[PDB]
Structure 1
């Protein structure tokens, strides 16, 4: 998530209703809904007790979309990104800590406190996601498990013209170069839509409305793949990018002190970290639903060697990739949990 991006470009947003996309196809960042609905039954999840409330919670939204003549594509997070492993470890430690503390408060008598910790302990597994997948596919709703981050997969589906809008809460979708993003959507169909073309309505951006410059800005402000230099947020990064008559981003990164008059000295590690972050935003592996193969989010440019981009996700055989995409192969255990086949009983 880009910390503060939604508030920074709020002039590019407008209140809409999803009836706007009647007859069209939209993709869904389902893990948001999963995280929301899991909270309704955090006690049972923490205690290990069985619960299927989040399933109905998601299917509620799904049916809401279906009622307005919309075809929703539920997209799920797949395997872990090495380039994001920091935030993943952080959140893991967080959830585990709140879990142990929750158990402690459970055996201390503290009720609401332990329940709160349980809310802050929920780890969305592929099992729950697969419950939602079966529940959705039972009603003809297409589902897709990304090879890695759902963000990149959604971005691809939107760029490929397969879907016309992305339903999510994460601002990263804009940094991935999505055209239309529906945020803050409730269970009725009311949400805030940010359009890429409307980024020009943001006076603060300046000439930083192009996909490349916008990406550079989001990265420089601080993303999930790279922490920002101390003292650098959205405004100063956008300032740097505005005051630059140079397409070569690296030289600009080095001259950040000049462009800001802040006397900043950049570490040599941060340059490579930036290269890696940009390469992750650009070339993270996604799954083609049509050709059924692992491709990068954007086509490889001639100035990059795919061999060096393992942190943007490593390749597997397209059979495995397809079985993952269908939700048959467990993301964690890598063992088969289902045997669904889109041929026997999208992807056309």
Structure 2
């Protein structure tokens, strides 16, 4: 996502412990636990050999949060946004390559390299995530499969007061407008918290501590929805945002070469791609657990047409979205793989 974002605003970071959120609700970007837990049993998944260590891993963290008296809500990624299809396919091809080479080209002789390639060809499937969901629900923990990206869903849960903090390793959460994000948490509950209001503690940031300006900085720096101009990182983006007074971001991006004293010819596609990136950060589709329907991250403004925001995810029926959120309906085939019912046991 946003490279070097954590180091850039480390002044706003506060080392905490999970006790600080006792008797409160916290949402967890489960994919990080799933991935770090799958790294341990990489060769097992590479060979196609049955294993469930990652389940015990995720449940270890969950049991920690529970032991400190916190109500955790596990969140998973759902469908992939159209602005990421070819990227996910690229990573798919990379995993296929690392698996093929790591297997056939390293089946005899070299072993360490074969494992080093197998750990790269590791793919987190929704079946594994479903195992985690079954275990978590067996331990009475609520789960939610996002309609699309997990970071938007989490940001919604946080901005709606449903949760008070978000445990993740992704730095993009801040660009979605989260209030409290707990990064780099270990087994015991030791992690780095970053509050939105505390963004002002960064002198280097200047007057770019407001949600909108901070978002513009994150996008200009280089995000998953849009690569940055060559030579533009966090410092340069922050600088050009600090210097410019004009509220209209388009003219600013057009004069990015003027404000930074460096020869930059802004591509025709970059402005539209910027608007699309910002619109994706603002209006990506999430699932409202209370109303049990599919809503945008933020309510649409007066200058935006919903029919042109297909890249921020497309709507489906609320019953289908509900079945997806419960992990009952498969992401790809849309087939019913489970029959969990929250009525006959959140979502109330």
Deviation at 1:264, TM superposition (A): 1.4
Q: Residues 65 and 189 of structure 1 are in contact (CA less than 8 Å); yes or no, is this contact kept in structure 2? A: yes
Q: Aligned partners of 1:301 and 1:109: how far apart in 2?
A: 61
**Which has the higher mean CA deviation after the structures are superposed, 44-53 or 107-116?**
107-116
CA distances 1:89-113 after superposition (whole Å, capped 9, x unpaired): 2322221221111112442332111
Deviation at 1:251, TM superposition (A): 0.7
Deviation at 1:86, TM superposition (A): 4.0
CA distances 1:99-134 after superposition (whole Å, capped 9, x unpaired): 111112442332111111111111111000000001
Q: Aligned partners of 2:215 and 2:110: how far apart in 1?
A: 45
Q: Residues 59 and 136 of structure 2 are in contact (CA less than 8 Å); yes or no, is this contact kept in structure 1? A: yes
CA distances 1:311-339 after superposition (whole Å, capped 9, x unpaired): 11011101110000000011122211100
Q: Residues 283 and 297 of structure 1 are in contact (CA less than 8 Å); yes or no, is this contact kept in structure 2? A: yes
Q: Aligned partners of 1:28 and 1:135: how far apart in 2?
A: 15
Deviation at 1:261, TM superposition (A): 1.2
Q: Residues 29 and 76 of structure 1 are in contact (CA less than 8 Å); yes or no, is this contact kept in structure 2? A: yes
Deviation at 1:87, TM superposition (A): 3.1
Q: Residues 83 and 280 of structure 1 are in contact (CA less than 8 Å); yes or no, is this contact kept in structure 2? A: no
CA distances 1:220-243 after superposition (whole Å, capped 9, x unpaired): 000001000000000000001101
Q: Aligned partners of 1:275 and 1:122: how far apart in 2?
A: 34
Q: Aligned partners of 2:97 and 2:316: how far apart in 1?
A: 33
Deviation at 1:83, TM superposition (A): 1.7
Aligned CA-pair RMSD: 0.9
Q: Residues 107 and 114 of structure 2 are in contact (CA less than 8 Å); yes or no, is this contact kept in structure 1? A: no
Deviation at 1:258, TM superposition (A): 1.1
Q: Aligned partners of 1:116 and 1:333: how far apart in 2?
A: 32
**3-state SS of 2:315 partner:** coil
Q: Aligned partners of 1:136 and 1:227: how far apart in 2?
A: 37
Q: Aligned partners of 1:90 and 1:173: how far apart in 2?
A: 24
Query: What is the match of residue 243 of structure 2?
Result: 243
Query: What is the match of residue 136 of structure 1?
Result: 136
Q: Aligned partners of 2:153 and 2:345: how far apart in 1?
A: 25
Sort the Cα spacing of 1:16 and 1:307 in 2 relative to 1 into closer, same or farther, 3 A.
Answer: same
Runs (5+) with no aligned partner, structure 2:
none
Q: Aligned partners of 1:286 and 1:99: how far apart in 2?
A: 34
Deviation at 1:302, TM superposition (A): 1.1
Q: Residues 282 and 298 of structure 2 are in contact (CA less than 8 Å); yes or no, is this contact kept in structure 1? A: yes
**Which has the higher mean CA deviation after the structures are superposed, 52-61 or 256-265?**
256-265
TM-score by length of 2: 0.98
Deviation at 1:47, TM superposition (A): 1.1
Q: Residues 329 and 338 of structure 1 are in contact (CA less than 8 Å); yes or no, is this contact kept in structure 2? A: yes
TM-score by length of 1: 0.98
